[PDB]
């Protein structure tokens, strides 16, 4: 029926728009264009909300968009991304980082550890020594003790050292540029997607 062939066609074009809005969000995140990132995020969230059912590839695209939003708001502590009011943005980005279907290589392990370290450092540079202690336990605590500096971070929290040199070596910017290194990988992986592809061809001849 003509109505059924239309609904499938809209679901196809919605997948093309979601991929493009992921490239635009990744590129605006890497380039540091804050306002273009805010508008592309709103366009991505509306298209995602319009999707009736998700595939495994689309869920991976949504988590990439979610991950970039919590990282962009990593230092905004009064921002609530999850229903649980105690989950800081960097804590939320850590849970998404472990959910994206991707390689668990050296770069993935470096980004994950930098998120854990900076999730506490962000609370340190605000006077929230109590929340930094709560964030430390939800991430590390004694689940299986799979981290070396797990004991070094605990003392720094007890130091109440708002600006410690350990947080500056595993800095917020070193976490940023390693995420952008992965963003550049996603930028190349999806550069051949339909909507951005045909749009590039139109501009090439012009």
């Amino acid at each position: 029926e003509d109505a059924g062939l239309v609904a499938e066609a809209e679901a196809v074009a919605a997948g093309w728009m979601l991929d493009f809005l992921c490239l635009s969000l990744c590129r605006a995140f890497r380039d540091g264009r804050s306002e273009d990132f805010r508008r592309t995020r709103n366009s991505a969230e509306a298209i995602i909300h319009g999707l009736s059912s998700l595939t495994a590839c689309q869920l991976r695209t949504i988590y990439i968009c979610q991950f970039l939003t919590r990282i962009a708001a990593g230092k905004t502590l009064d921002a609530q991304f999850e229903n649980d009011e105690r989950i800081t943005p960097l804590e939320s980005a850590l849970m998404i980082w472990g959910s994206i279907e991707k390689e668990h290589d050296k770069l993935h392990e470096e980004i994950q550890n930098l998120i854990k370290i900076q999730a506490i450092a962000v609370c340190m540079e605000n006077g929230n020594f109590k929340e930094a202690e709560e964030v430390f336990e939800r991430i590390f605590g004694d689940p299986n003790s799979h981290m070396p500096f797990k004991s070094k971070l605990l003392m720094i929290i007890s130091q109440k050292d708002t600006f410690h040199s350990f947080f500056q070596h595993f800095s917020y910017n070193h976490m940023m540029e390693k995420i952008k290194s992965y963003v550049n990988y996603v930028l190349s992986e999806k550069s051949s997607t339909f909507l951005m592809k045909a749009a590039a061809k139109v501009v090439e001849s012009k």
Binding site: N42, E45, I48, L54, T69, A73, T76
Partner: peptide
């Protein structure tokens, strides 16, 4: 579904 995923956070966490 798609309605379960949010990109925008809330003020005053």
């Amino acid at each position: 579904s798609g309605r379960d995923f949010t990109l925008k956070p809330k003020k005053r966490r």
